[PDB]
Amino acid sequence: QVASEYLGGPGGDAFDDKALAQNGDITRIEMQCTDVATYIKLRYGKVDSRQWGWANENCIQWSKKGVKVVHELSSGEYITSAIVTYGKYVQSITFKTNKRTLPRCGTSATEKSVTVLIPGGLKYISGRWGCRIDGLRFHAKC
Amino acid sequence: EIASEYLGGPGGDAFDDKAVAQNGDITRIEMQCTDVATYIKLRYGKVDSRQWGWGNENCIQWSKKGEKVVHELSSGEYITSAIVTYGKYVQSITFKTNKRTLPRCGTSATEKSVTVLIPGGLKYISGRWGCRIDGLRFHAKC
């Protein structure tokens, strides 16, 4: 389907939620948030993706960890906007839906910022990950 | 029935290519480009819309005019995203197709910027217009 550019750096390993997204529309957003966003895990219908980020609790060498943040989406709710700040890594993620605007994950928003609009709702993410979210790409439904 | 939010300001007169787009898929982008994009005019199959912008030559009293730019789409090529900078008006537009990123219309890109995904390809545009492009809304095929 249509996809944004890749937002972030070259580190970590690639991931692509495409196949998992065939289970259904996103029903839930889970992140771990401190001064930056250290992982992202979407639920597609009733099936969670893997935890994309914070590979290991020993990641506490190079960044704060943060607290788990879960936003359950209501039926018919979908993600229409993602504001991402990023350089070598994704720094912060602010999601808006057709129903509400969620709090930013990542209190520091000092890196270069991009706003991606997804009419009809986000279908899934891909990117790269390890101890953090090295980068994100946003995929539309068609 | 999927469409982006309206990007731009309240001036001009509303336009909507919904009807003229029954003539077929977009085959050409014609714009007028200086430091801003002053008009847009898509061709739907063989039929052009009216010129949405640069109402008349007295508009030179308020902004530069620019040069006509035409991008011909090949069969099976469709517009999949637009980077739009905008405020009171549309400032610049960089269209991307499933085959290529095209040159930007409007050399100045200093106003708020959004990357609009257009799922399934652009079906048609709506917006508002006068001496320039007050605003745009992208109607997706999805």
Ligand SMILES: OC[C@H]1O[C@H](OC[C@H]2O[C@@H](O)[C@H](O)[C@@H](O)[C@@H]2O)[C@H](O)[C@@H](O)[C@@H]1O
């Ligand atoms: O996802 C971020 C990062 O995770 C892993 O690297 C973690 C740190 O390892 C150190 O050697 C380096 O000095 C730090 O900058 C790294 O954050 C992973 O090995 C790497 O590929 C990822 O980019």
Ligand SMILES: OC[C@H]1O[C@H](OC[C@H]2O[C@@H](O)[C@H](O)[C@@H](O)[C@@H]2O)[C@H](O)[C@@H](O)[C@@H]1O
């Ligand atoms: O399409 C933009 C603009 O076109 C016409 O306005 C042109 C200018 O008129 C002046 O009075 C005004 O001070 C300027 O800001 C305008 O650019 C149209 O009348 C207007 O509705 C449109 O916004």
